[PDB]
Amino acid sequence: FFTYETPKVIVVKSWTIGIINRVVQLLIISYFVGWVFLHEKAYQVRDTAIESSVVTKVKGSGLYANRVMDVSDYVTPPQGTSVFVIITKMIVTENQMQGFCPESEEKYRCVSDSQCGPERLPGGGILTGRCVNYSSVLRTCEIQGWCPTEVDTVETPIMMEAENFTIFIKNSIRFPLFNFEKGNLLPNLTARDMKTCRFHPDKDPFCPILRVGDVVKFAGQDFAKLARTGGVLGIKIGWVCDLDKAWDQCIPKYSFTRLDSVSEKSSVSPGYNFRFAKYYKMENGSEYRTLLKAFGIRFDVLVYGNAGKFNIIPTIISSVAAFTSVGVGTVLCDIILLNFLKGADQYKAKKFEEVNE
Template identity: 70%
Template sequence: MTKVKGFGEYNNRIMDVADYVTPTQGASVFCVITKLITTENQVQGHCPESEVKFKCDSDSTCKRLMSKPSSNGLLTGRCVNFNDTHKTCEIKGWCPAEIDEIQPNPMKEVENFTIFIKNSIRFPRFNFTKGNFLPNINSTYIKQCNFDFESNMYCPIFKVGDVIRFAQQNFTTLAKKGGVIGIKIAWVCDLDKAEDECKPAYSFTRLDAMSEKTVVSPGYNFRYAKYFKMENGTEYRTLLKAYAIRFDVLVNGDAGKFDMIPTIINMVAAFTSVGVGTVLCDIILLNFLKGADQYKAKKFEEVSDSHIQSNNSLYRTRDHSQHSIKTDEKFSNDSGAFSIGQYS
């Protein structure tokens, strides 16, 4: 569960959580809006396109562009006046068309907003559940703490500016273009120790690091609208293009506990893989079981001294015979070559 708190001033308006946080509070993924481009009182109708790439001189130009997608509506193929200086192609849709070339400054108070994270993890195999509210956390501590890596490692309240710095990002740049920040909560628990030793570890990173390196679509933004109706039933809306910092709370956990049966199985598997199992079995069978003599008789062949001496004599006889054969060999220096000459 997540919750954001803070107030900011934007376009001469005071904005609270309901204005700048989307979607609604409590999700593990939420956005804090830093900048808005507002197009008010849009109604269904016909109007000139606002983008420069749809500038035209005649209807023929717009008819050629009809195959290209428009950002604000369906092209009609007509060239109409955008203002006193130039014309653009006409669209059918929500009018007037959005103009997002004028970029307002971001809401600077966002840096001091706070994020409250309430997290718990369960390891069903061990029937163990733990939350990030440690025993020393009480209402007094919550009201005055902010997370840091030195003195408040387990405080569940995070300043937006601190989170961005921990992720090694610049707040001003991120507030202008938007981005995605990951808040990682890792639970690595040794359940053989006391329950209080199982504590969360927080880390922070930018998840869309590649988007900041491209000029095509840098940062993070989205559009949404607020719809209204006039007394005569005509529907109109306010279109908002929001630049935001999106926070993704990512939780992972790993727990372990000593168990005799898996330990024995793993030891047997390890011994078998290196051949130790065979040696251990032989030691046990040859020395500790009742049938050790029978196993030893099958395992080994006993040889007497007289048998060994007779074998040695046989080997000496063979060596002498081979030596005699070698001394009787005759050698010739004739290479076997001969020449063919003319007989006289």
């Protein structure tokens, strides 16, 4: 039988419970309108899956080890990705060749060939088993490998000029849920701007060219100490865009920070360095290499974003849930009514029809 059910309802008219319920209903409606709808923007579909593309180019010259260094000297790797390192400090060990030689660290002090056993395996090459004089004051164990051994201890200068190098970022973003593409290079960017512009979070926040010193500062870092220890700085590019607004309002927000924080809270591993070698070989077949322990700043360009565009489906579902939530005040209103007018028994009686068996 096609029958429509619906509850039998009391309709109290006390001025007290009347205004207090109307106030609870007003607060519920305003909370859902201002928060769930305006702020949290539940009326639009959200896309967090951003497509990004970063192309970088470093520019500048520096003085180091009686050489003039250009980008190709101090940037590694060079293909211009969202991660690159700018070498600021280098410990060079020139012209290593395969042979036999003693270690240079005081950690390998010896007086007899009997001590040079399978105990200290890492570092350099393989122990030859002999104990050989490294200097007039020190004897260390002999190893086969790349000779002469590097000295890790003597500090070398840093390339101050790197502070004035320039990082150019080319970022292409696409939100697929809305098929919306934009880049951090607006159409009104000119060649003249590019040759001279200067990024600043306030004075020029759209200039694709970032001064390394500016970035180091923005992360609160001291160029001298950082270029001495090496480290990683993160350049974050945020694309929080409400596409219901104007197209030209989808705009990139720059952030700057230091990513390798653990290094400062450690006296044992304070920075970031890596070792690599330039390989040459003579007219004779023998090979030799220049071994460089490089200290520098690694840069990660981190591009995130989320875009929301209005659709009717989330709007409908949110309005349905809003109407279904306006009712929740009935329980609190029940408590107030049934326990705060002295004649509470009247309402308990009006509402409750007991049964027993």
